[PDB]
Structures are given as structure tokens and as C-alpha cells.
């Protein structure tokens, strides 16, 4: 399975001031960036064009270049005539591929960090609990059928189409295996007498990984796994802490399983 996301983030500060910057992803790896100040959409990968021709790409790019200016201008007007009188808006759009060329497309808008509108089927839709004053705007926008047909083409059609192309185009990148290097350390805990052993594991790809403190073969189930943290060279960082009685460190090892190792695990002893 693979999720393809187009994240747009627009801020309006004044009526003089506003900007839109997008970035798109295929799971882990960013495929595109598009700054407010660049007139075209940058490719962060060699395969960021997927399979579409220069023609076909440029067609889709022209459409976004129009959308961006429009979106800004429309939203600024929405600002004038609104609320009592109140900005940060976000779009997450794309699709999720599946075994049998299946996918669910999506498009969600958040206003002030809260999810408020999505496009579903054929019309725009205020989501339950959203501010009432969005009803009217969302209706006016639903009167523009061109944009609804456009948005339906992009979701139903272009998204799977393009993304399929990316999967082939990017194969070697997405199926890269990068090996984790691991290191150990410890720090005192709150509890007196207790120390916290840490197992740092950095540089692995893809994300899924297994890091357990072992005593021989008894999986030390107190092992607490941290959050996955990104490196900049497109690999992952994780660490697993195990709290222990001082001296109870003796004979402990942390081991790591990961696709990239075949089945030859890493096992730092303490």
C-alpha cells in the first residue's frame, strides 16, 4: 500500500500579505516542493515526473498555476465579507494505492488547524461541527461545476494514474534498503538506584524496524520504543530505552531486526 499526499499550506496575514507553499510525498519520500516564490513546481526526485510526458505534465502544471492565484484571490475576498470578522488554511489531497490497482482518493481542508471541508463524490462538503458561515461559501463554490468536474478528474483519474507512474519510475528509491547503525548509552532515571539504558538506531530504510533489549533470549518487555525521527539523508532514527536497577545492566544486549540485514541481526552488548 502507498499513500500519495499533496500538502498545501497557505497563510493570510493581511490583505497585503499571504503565501502558499506546497510539498508532496509518496509515503516516506518527498517527490515535489513548490515555494510561493517559484512559478513552477520543483522536482525533489529524478522520477518526480512519473510517466506523464512533458506535455501532460505541463498541462497539469498550468492548471495548478491558475488554481494558486485563484485560490489566493478568492480566499482574500472570502476574508472581506465574513464571520463577525476574524488566517491559516491547509489542503491534504491525494490517493492510497492497493494490491489490485485500487485506491481511495481524498481531499481535506483545515482552517486554523481544524478540519472543516472535504470534497466527496461530486460536491464540496462542510464537515460536521464546522462553523455555520462556511455553509454559504461552500455552496457558492459548489455552483462552479467546472471546478467540480476538474476536481473529480484529478481525484478519480489523475491521482491513481500519476501515482502508478511514480511507483514504477521511483522503484529503486522506494525499494531501497539502508542499514541501521546502532549505539548504546545510559542516563540516570528519577528513581534512585535506577538507570536508563538507551539503544540508538540510525540510518535505516524503510521505516519498519524492531529494537528490543534482550537478556540472552528473554525479551526484556519493559523496553520502551521512542518515536521514529527523520534524518535528512532520507533514513530513519529510532531509540529504545530500558530502565534498570544499577548493576542489573550486566549481561544485557540490545538487538535489532530490519529488512536490510537479511536475517543477520545487530546485537550490541553492554
Amino acid at each position: 500500500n502507498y499513500t500519495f499526499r499533496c500538502l498545501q499550506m497557505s497563510s493570510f496575514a493581511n490583505r497585503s500579505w499571504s503565501r502558499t507553499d506546497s510539498v508532496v510525498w509518496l509515503g516516506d519520500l518527498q517527490t515535489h516542493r513548490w515555494s510561493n516564490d517559484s512559478a513552477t513546481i520543483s522536482f525533489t526526485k529524478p522520477w518526480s515526473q512519473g510517466k506523464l510526458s512533458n506535455q501532460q505534465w505541463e498541462k497539469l502544471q498550468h492548471m495548478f498555476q491558475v488554481y494558486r492565484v485563484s485560490f489566493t484571490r478568492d480566499i482574500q475576498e472570502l476574508v472581506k465579507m465574513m464571520s463577525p470578522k476574524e488566517i491559516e488554511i491547509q489542503l491534504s489531497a491525494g490517493c492510497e494505492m492497493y494490491p489490485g490497482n485500487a485506491s481511495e482518493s481524498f481531499l481535506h481542508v483545515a482552517f486554523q488547524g481544524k478540519y472543516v471541508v472535504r470534497f466527496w463524490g461530486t460536491s464540496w462538503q462542510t464537515v460536521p461541527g464546522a462553523p455555520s458561515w462556511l455553509d454559504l461559501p461552500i455552496k457558492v463554490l459548489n455552483a462552479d461545476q467546472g471546478t467540480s468536474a476538474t476536481v473529480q478528474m484529478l481525484l478519480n483519474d489523475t491521482c491513481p494514474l500519476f501515482v502508478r507512474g511514480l511507483l514504477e519510475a521511483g522503484k529503486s528509491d522506494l525499494e531501497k534498503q539502508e542499514k541501521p547503525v546502532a549505539w548504546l548509552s545510559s542516563v540516570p532515571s528519577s528513581a534512585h538506584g535506577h538507570r536508563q539504558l538507551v539503544c540508538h538506531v540510525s540510518g535505516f530504510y524503510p521505516k519498519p524496524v524492531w529494537v528490543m533489549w534482550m537478556r540472552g533470549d528473554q525479551e526484556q518487555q519493559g523496553t520502551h520504543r521512542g518515536d521514529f525521527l527523520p534524518n535528512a539523508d532520507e533514513t530513519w532514527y529510532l531509540q529504545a530505552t530500558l530502565d534498570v536497577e544499577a548493576g542489573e545492566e550486566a549481561g544485557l544486549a540490545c538487538r535489532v531486526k530490519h529488512s536490510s540485514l537479511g536475517g543477520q541481526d545487530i546485537i550490541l552488548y553492554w
Binding site: 497563510s11 491559516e88 548509552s185 545510559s186 542516563v187 540508538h200 540510518g203
Partner: protein, 99 residues
């Protein structure tokens, strides 16, 4: 609303004294998306800091990765200071190799 950043500071490789490494400052869970991030060597600001394009999670909150090149030593301490509307004072999270 204003969601405040969480900040994490971790080396790319096992840190070793005298040995060139990369230092990451993952800032996360914040909103709005306007932020200054500084990375500090011994209180002084590091000028050469590269940054990821801002993005956001399923949960709408923004996250950004800054990183710089550094050679850890016994004595040089490193940190990451963040400026953000959700917070009166800048936050500073000190690198801690052992952590």
C-alpha cells in the same frame, strides 16, 4: 489554536569525539506554521543550518527538520532554540549524546 512545538535533538551517527557528524533538530506538533529555529554551539548561533521544507502530519500540525554539520567534543555543548508565537520565551533543548 496555538499548538506549541516539541523539539528533539539527535545525531546522525554514533557521536565520537573529534569525528565529523550531523546534528538534527526535529521540531514537531506546532501551529501556526511560522517559526525561527536556531542551532547553537556553546550558546553562539550556527550560521550554516539547512532545513527541510515545512510539512504537516495527518493531524494537521506542522513539523520541520533542521540539521547542521558538527564535530562533537568532550566540552562543546550543543542546542536548538525555537521562536514561536505559542510561547513567551524561546525553547532550548540541549543535545545530550547519552540521551
Amino acid at each position: 489554536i496555538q499548538k506549541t512545538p516539541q523539539i528533539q535533538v539527535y545525531s546522525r551517527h554514533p557521536p565520537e569525539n573529534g569525528k565529523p557528524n550531523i546534528l538534527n533538530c526535529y521540531v514537531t506538533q506546532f501551529h501556526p506554521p511560522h517559526i525561527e529555529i536556531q542551532m547553537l554551539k556553546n550558546g553562539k548561533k550556527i550560521p550554516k543550518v539547512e532545513m527541510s521544507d515545512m510539512s504537516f502530519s495527518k493531524d494537521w500540525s506542522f513539523y520541520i527538520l533542521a540539521h547542521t554539520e558538527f564535530t562533537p567534543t568532550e566540552t562543546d555543548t550543543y542546542a536548538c532554540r525555537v521562536k514561536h508565537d505559542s510561547m513567551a520565551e524561546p525553547k532550548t533543548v540541549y543535545w545530550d549524546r547519552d540521551m
